[PDB]
Amino acid sequence: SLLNSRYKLVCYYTNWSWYRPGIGKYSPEDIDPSLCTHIVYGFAVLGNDGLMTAHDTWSDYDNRFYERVVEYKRYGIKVSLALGGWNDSAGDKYSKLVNDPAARAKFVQHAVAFLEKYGFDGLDLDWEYPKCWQVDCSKGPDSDKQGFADLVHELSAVLKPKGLLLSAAVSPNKMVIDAGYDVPVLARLLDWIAVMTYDYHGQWDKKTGHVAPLYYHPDDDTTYFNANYTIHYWMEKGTPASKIVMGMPMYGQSFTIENRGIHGLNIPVSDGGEPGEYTRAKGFLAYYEICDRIRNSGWTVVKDPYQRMGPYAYKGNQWVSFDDVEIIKKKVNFIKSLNLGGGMIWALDLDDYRNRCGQGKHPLLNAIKTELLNPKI
Ligand SMILES: *[C@@H]1O[C@H](CO)[C@@H](O)[C@H](O)[C@H]1NC(C)=O
């Protein structure tokens, strides 16, 4: 059992996975509580009044999704609510909040009342990102760093005496870490730091690349776009290993490659990949969409014999990089070897929870749990 282990397994739940057809539909009752130590609910958002509020009132309130996920506390799981996410981070509202001490003071008392009203065990901060709004460091003021650090302190001061948790999902990008994070403050105050060691590469690069490399690859344009660099950088900046939980993607980044008759890494790309039937997002495919293309649509799979990264798969002008069970076990061994706090997944609803691909239900997440519980490194 994971609840008896020395590691966390932090599972993100997404309320919008409900709005998918057929086998892609995901509900709170689909959560498998044997596979997580912590569940984080994505997402609440920052309202126009500077107060945390439900993003989807139809699901979160009218259909009681908050209560139906907090349900899983009865199994010994810690259930947190996440604030923010990529879409909520587009503008300046988080910046406006953290640069105004009076706005922070009002937000903090309301936020803890919000958590206690619905029974949440904690708050997860997912601002992407302080200073570098949606990764553009030219947008925000440097004071976002001190503002966010002070917000974390002020939340911790109210949450911790109540026994409530405080965590944050953070950038894997050296640039963002340098510009937006006061790492020693975050490392001291947060119960864990969920490092989003994925989306290193995607359609925005205009060439193919892996969503979540583990180690440096010779063809990389940087030394630092891999999980091994990222995790060591967080520690070098002052983060104890026990506070770090390493993110792992249950999905792939997809590409429409240019017509040049090649299919490897770093080949020119004209657009994101065609949307999947269930996830409906150009450039994105759930694992259960990827594994069906391999099994039943003849996509060719290319694996790294050195295991610096997971596989990629392609057919025609479509190309996708993702993590398979093999590289997942490698990443979890990495986690154990550095004595990190554990692992994190994005997201529950993107793994093959229905056993559509015949490897068993939740093949990626079960691979993580099995390897976390295996004493051998
Ligand atoms: C992982 O990163 C560490 C610290 O940056 C480095 O010493 C080591 O060479 C890396 N491991 C690889 C590339 O396999």
Numbering used by the authors: 1606 to 1868, 1879 to 1992
What does the paper say about this structure?
The crystal belonged to space group P41212, and each asymmetric unit contained a single molecule. According to the structural characteristics, OfChtII-C1 could be divided into two distinct domains: a core domain and an insertion domain (CID). The catalytic signature motif of GH18 chitinases, DXDXE (Asp1729–Glu1733), is located between β4 and α4. A long substrate-binding cleft, which comprises a series of conservative aromatic residues (Trp1621, Tyr1624, Trp1663, Trp1691, Trp1809, and Trp1961), is observed on the surface of OfChtII-C1. A conserved tryptophan on the surface of OfChtII-C1 was rotated 28.3° closer to the catalytic residue Glu1733 compared with the corresponding residue in OfChtII-C2, which could make the substrate more accessible to the catalytic residues. SmChiC lacks the α+β insertion domain, which is responsible for forming one “wall” of the substrate-binding cleft of OfChtII-C1.
Here we report the catalytic properties and the crystal structures of the catalytic domains of OfChtII, the ChtII derived from the Asian corn borer O. furnacalis. The other two GH18 domains (C1 and C2) are predicted to be catalytically active (CAD).
